[PDB]
Amino acid sequence: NDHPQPLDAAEIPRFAGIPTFMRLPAFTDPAALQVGLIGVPWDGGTTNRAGARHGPREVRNLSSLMRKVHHVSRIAPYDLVRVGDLGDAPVNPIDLLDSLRRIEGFYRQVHAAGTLPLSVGGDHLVTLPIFRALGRERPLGMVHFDAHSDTNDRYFGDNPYTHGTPFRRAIEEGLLDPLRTVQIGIRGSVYSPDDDAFARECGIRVIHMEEFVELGVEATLAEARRVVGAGPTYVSFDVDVLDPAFAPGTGTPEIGGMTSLQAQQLVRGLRGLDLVGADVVEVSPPFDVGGATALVGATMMFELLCLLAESAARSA
Amino acid sequence: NDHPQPLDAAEIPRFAGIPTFMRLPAFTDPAALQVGLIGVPWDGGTTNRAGARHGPREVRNLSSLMRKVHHVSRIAPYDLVRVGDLGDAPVNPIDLLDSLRRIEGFYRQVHAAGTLPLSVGGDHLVTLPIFRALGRERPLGMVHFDAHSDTNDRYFGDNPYTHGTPFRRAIEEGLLDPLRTVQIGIRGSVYSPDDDAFARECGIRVIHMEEFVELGVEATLAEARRVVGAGPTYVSFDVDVLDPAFAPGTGTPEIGGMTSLQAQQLVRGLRGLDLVGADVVEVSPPFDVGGATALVGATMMFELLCLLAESAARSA
Amino acid sequence: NDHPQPLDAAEIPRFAGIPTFMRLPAFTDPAALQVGLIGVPWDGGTTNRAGARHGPREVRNLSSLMRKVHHVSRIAPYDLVRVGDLGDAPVNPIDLLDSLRRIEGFYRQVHAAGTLPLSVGGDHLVTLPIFRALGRERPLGMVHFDAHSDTNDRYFGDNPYTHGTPFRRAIEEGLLDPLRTVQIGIRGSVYSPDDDAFARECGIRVIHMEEFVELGVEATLAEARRVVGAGPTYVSFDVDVLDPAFAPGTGTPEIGGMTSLQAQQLVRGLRGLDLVGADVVEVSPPFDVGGATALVGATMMFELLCLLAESAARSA
Amino acid sequence: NDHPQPLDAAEIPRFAGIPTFMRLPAFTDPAALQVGLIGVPWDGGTTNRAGARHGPREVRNLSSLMRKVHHVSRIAPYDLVRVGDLGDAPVNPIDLLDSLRRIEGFYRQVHAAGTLPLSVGGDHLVTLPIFRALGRERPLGMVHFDAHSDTNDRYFGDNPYTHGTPFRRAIEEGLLDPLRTVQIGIRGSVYSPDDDAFARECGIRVIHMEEFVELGVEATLAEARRVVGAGPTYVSFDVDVLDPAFAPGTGTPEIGGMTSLQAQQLVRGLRGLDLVGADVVEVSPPFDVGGATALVGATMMFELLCLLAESAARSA
Amino acid sequence: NDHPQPLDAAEIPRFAGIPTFMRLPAFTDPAALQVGLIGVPWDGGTTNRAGARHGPREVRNLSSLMRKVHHVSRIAPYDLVRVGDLGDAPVNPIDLLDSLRRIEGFYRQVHAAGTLPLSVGGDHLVTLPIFRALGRERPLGMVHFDAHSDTNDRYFGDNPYTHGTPFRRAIEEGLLDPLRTVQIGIRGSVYSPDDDAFARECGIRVIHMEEFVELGVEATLAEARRVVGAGPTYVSFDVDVLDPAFAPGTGTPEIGGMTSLQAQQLVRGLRGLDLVGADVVEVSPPFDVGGATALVGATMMFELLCLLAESAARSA
Amino acid sequence: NDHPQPLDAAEIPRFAGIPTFMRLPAFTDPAALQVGLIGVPWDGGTTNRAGARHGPREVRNLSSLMRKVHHVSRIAPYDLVRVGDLGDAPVNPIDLLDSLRRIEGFYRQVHAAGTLPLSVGGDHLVTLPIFRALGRERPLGMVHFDAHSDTNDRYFGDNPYTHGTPFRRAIEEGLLDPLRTVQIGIRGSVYSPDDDAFARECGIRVIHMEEFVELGVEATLAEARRVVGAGPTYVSFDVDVLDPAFAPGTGTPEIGGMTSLQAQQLVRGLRGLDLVGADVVEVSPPFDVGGATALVGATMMFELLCLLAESAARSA
Ligand SMILES: NCCCCCCN
Ligand SMILES: NCCCCCCN
């Protein structure tokens, strides 16, 4: 084939070998890849239960359990395109602004090379430096799976950058197109009598958990696809969209959430869209249980990888 | 506008502050409040896996994650009515009858002041002294979420007070109207071929787990609303109604239970009933996993708080 | 009416007593029982995450929670037939072939006595020696719940015996009738774009997780029954069929799985079939969380026991 | 020598077999044994963190790791005398007074048969009913390893029976001889500014943690042997004597404790005394980490078994 | 005493009541107290494994186990002086400088009122704003128990503030007298071929783990007392001085440490010094096991409280 | 200063980067290195509690906390010699003899290149193939830290290869000189009166735990050095030598063991000896607690590395 390949499991047992994403070779140069698997070990944007800085290491670890071919779509992503583990974006645990700069820097090297990034957080603030690099020319659409909109304004006085502000920033900076943004799974007590105010004024489509239950998977999918249409789309997967039973290891859980099953069905349903990048954020190992949330992370990573592979091929 | 409010999360982070229910101020006088949040740290009635005496503390802890406004109903409970943390009902861990007296004494003051109690257990026996305080004037109706009927007679072999007997006592003492009692979620193997002896003979509506699946949420909700009518009604939520996946921290789990999502749907559907009190019972921290069951309790508590707040508002 | 009985829970509490299956007496002679509860503490067939050798002990422990009478069917299994704990099948943790030899040996003694076996694993390889003893005369039909087909050929060279090959082996050896085999819950990424090859060629009905969801419980059930028919049938239950939310303590978890509730419904729907034995495999205590998987295992064990008790009852 | 033996580890691996104490056969008749291994699954005496009721079960489990011969003394207890698992003493989890009565009942049957008990608690109150059976003829001496004196008077009013009063009761009842009591390891903040008042009035030798440190093992032992002399002596080992690092699974930890090493040395040095019984109490699985404390419990149990075996052989 | 007192355990069980340090009443005004118990829930200075922001809440929880009187020195701190829970110092989880400013501001009020602070972190950076409030008039002496000197210069560029720089800052700012600073337990691999460069150059007495082992407790103590003399001294206790076995719940563990016992002996031996404040830092619940480190923290707090109370009593 | 270096911690934080031993670069060619860090993830030799196959991945993860310079000895191993991560020796989870051949194959290539191996298991059986490669020309001496002598003969019939036989095999194969072999820490009950036969009859120096305590660290060190002399010597460090308090994550724990501190003092005292290689074995993640034992493994690995670096430097 000649593409980078995972360590062969008929030969090296899955517990063995240096833990890389999907057991792929490590790369330093983004031009060597069509899809780059990237860690963003960064949780400076976390105002309560931190720990998502350990997400990437543990996702790497549990991705050992992933196999080469998707059993539904039959996509063999490593055969389709050049995929590899591109390491961790530079992070500064003590300096939020420095991290923001340096992560953007890293991502514009990735974008300049033409690689589609598949990223593991890190809390949800990580998605902003990524959009800063990927949405310069044209604004992005987005399918966003989350318990929270992450479109708040300020925290603890007037700090504009937290894991709860990234999509407001991205919209203000013109990186995210709100008319092509759909959010799925929003739930839990809120600060305000009309929380979806910013959302409604700029026209974000918010499918709350309760609307997702009313609609069902198919109708929700039809509505997500309708919102993003034909244009360049990013997929942001916050593991907190899932119920705590499936994703305990997360900073801001809200009970009464999506099932793993349902998340796989929704992601699988995005086949054919022009996906320009994706992430899996908020995996927090210090609140995780037997690496349950790290495994969810790894699997959802692979689900997204398969579709990114197809978009990277189409884009070539 | 002058009601007790949670600590301001724009000022004081959720990991900070001495931990009270919902970050509310502590109160000793129930006349200061319309809805009172009360712990009953008591498990003297547990015949197997104990630890529910630690429930109220961990629920307080995890309730730090609750916010001011319900996202569906828009109810802002601390603006509608005055809510506060009344601390723990006094408990004697070595003397069961002394606990029964003292817990009731506490609830007697709460009832005299006209305050609706919202309680956290404690095993299910804690509901009895509450009913003894709350049901003397007219027998209460009840919506009861549980895996068990808790209507047994005697254990080992002349003891009338366990977590399995509170509602038999309540019916015998004329405090609980069985003809206005609905039990939802009952499941798990039983001791003898006829479990439902007492339950059927006094006319309790028992919606077993199986019937609840046949029925679905909306029809169950309508049957529960039919049974309790326009009369004064108590809501008892036993976390063991949930599947262990959502609530592992409980003494007597039975697999194949309710989802947190389903529980929220069913409790929200109780809107508008004449609710005179409610509790969340059987959270047992020594069997809990990373505060999961404590978070469930805290959230279900917030769900009940909203409905209780509306009742207390209608009374004023 | 002189049948072996569980310890009397109205006199001896569930935390007390030597842990045997279902708190029953221990037996060493299979002819003394119609249904024998057997542990197969064996995981030499495991290629990655091991630990199922500890399964039977923890299932013994957690089976303390089971009661005497099924609450839906009203089957009192210990009244219907003679049930007991037959101990553990002989295992050599260090010699795979010797274990196969000895496990088969033990199971032919069980078979020669007309005792129906209900077995707790152990990884899925355990089912092969059992099959070699139960299917010498006439091949078995099977209802198989798993995340994996376990019909692979070879591993790490020319090794034909792992937890992923037992049903391929059983079919080749004429012990399992593929035309009377249905498999339910298969999911997760695979090694090749053509995985169901062996299954499609010999005619195994494979119901993947995706098809189970499209089908629903009742239609899945009718299909399962259509496949096995009136003939002699084994039920093999691998806990990894369950979403890791319900069964974390297993070696090869795959997300987006079956709920505990669904498994109960599906197993309960096998009533009336000519069931000649069953097993519950792949419970791995070292990856379990507070015995949840061991509890699930004990419960499924009770569910199967009821059905088997009905089968043993019919014969005389 | 025709004496009961553990399952053969050279043949049956340690993860296998029904979990009895030391993998010994189970007995019903005390007269069949010279040393009886007994569980007392009782924690009605616990006023704060409970769970010791599950102690005997988890100790049975982890005793699977024990071997047949002591590596220092070379005592082979099963060769010397007849040892077996006598099951659990009857317990009433709801009724304290009924428990005391039924446990005594069980122990006087054990005593009437000339059988030396080796008991696993259960909280410390469990030793009282044992002393009530064993202390009738001559009052007993004791070497007692604990963080607390367990010689308090009343709790929560006029309650004379908790895990903190057994030894005061036993002295008042003339079952324990204070002049022949030595207590080793006492430490931790106290309620009373003069806590040791009772112990000093009746002449109990109290070697506090601080004094044990100054004395060292050899000299502490000389002093413990002096106190108990040649008379009949019980050993009561409370795991909370150990530092929480070695025994986390206990209800009332006090840091800065004894090491497992030190405890082994101290018990080993009691060889040659007339030991008429022993217990290991306060193992609390709900607060345990990976069965650490259960293992400690099982090992100390074996340490004592060897000594009790020598005393039993001496008498016969 | 008329002094504030812990909840009466003879009446109120230790698992009940809204949890405060040592079960004392909650205070808002530092002039009401002679020793103030304060939480600094702050870990913005943490460069790797964080979580210490949850320290104060869990130390509060586990301090429920503390009793009224020290069992060795016989000091009863609450009878000696007025002690209370002052709550948490204000903390900004996003703005490091804003926290430094606000924490100091809180301690300024505390110091102005003549109140002696006993603090629970939070990571070690938290000691800097404390020193900033306490060491302006005259520089402080210090006994510092730690695995690390915390006298490094810069991190990740020129960030002057981390858990590893605070004492470097305090010396530079004239708040700490290096000549009256002694550090005990220092150990672990270092970044650079010469580490104690700064510490030796300004003349801090550094007693590495190895020297403490050679010296022994008494001789270590005599050296520490020689260093601090008769002048005003602060005691800063980093739980990571302890072996991971005694304190697993900490961010930067180094194996082969001090035991709880040794730590208690070293603190007890500080009796009679002019102690003006103390802290217990680096308790990190997300890495803790069953609250082990919280309990150590709570107990070391009590050890420190007893001596602080005597100092405050001398002054009065 | 052209040697391989760990990721720069002033630039790249410890939670970031692909997890290699000590965050060194990954090598594939042994000839590139003077000291080779190797994982041997193999537990086929385990007769009871397995999981050591996961040892090397977790030790890699936690080795992230190691720094560049030994604080006592001042050895900067990466400046001294060329050190790197050689990956994992090949392993067949299902085939013991093939693992034996293939692991030896790998170490043969390592030995041919002049590279000193520093290895992480895997269970203690992993040392045999290592010795088979390193001990042909002349037999090795050994310092061996363990709770067990690992010189048993056969298990479960005649299987000559388990984690309890490696040194029996190595001695019989002329690879280990028993007259230059010292074992330290041996303890715990034994299977029969005469297991120890082999070790004494061939003259291994066996320093039991009891004797180690009698001798003390310094005299144990003197005796270990006397046994090995100036000849080529291997160090085999089994984490089960440590008390379970310090090393919970291990398959066959024996309470009453060495402390982390003692182990460090002992290994550090091996400076100057002709060390030809070392290993750290029996780290078993499925039994570890928050990675405690992996961290111990990582530190002991660093301690050993520093000494190995000196040996490599002298040869060159
Ligand atoms: N929520 C599912 C993630 C997988 C956890 C399984 C680990 N045994
Ligand atoms: N299932 C209830 C909530 C559990 C999530 C807790 C994450 N720490």
Ligand SMILES: NCCCCCCN
């Ligand atoms: N105190 C240590 C007892 C043993 C723990 C080892 C792993 N279960």
Ligand SMILES: NCCCCCCN
């Ligand atoms: N001198 C003891 C050093 C401990 C090193 C750090 C281990 N994690």
Ligand SMILES: NCCCCCCN
């Ligand atoms: N190392 C002190 C903590 C003790 C833990 C016991 C149970 N929380």
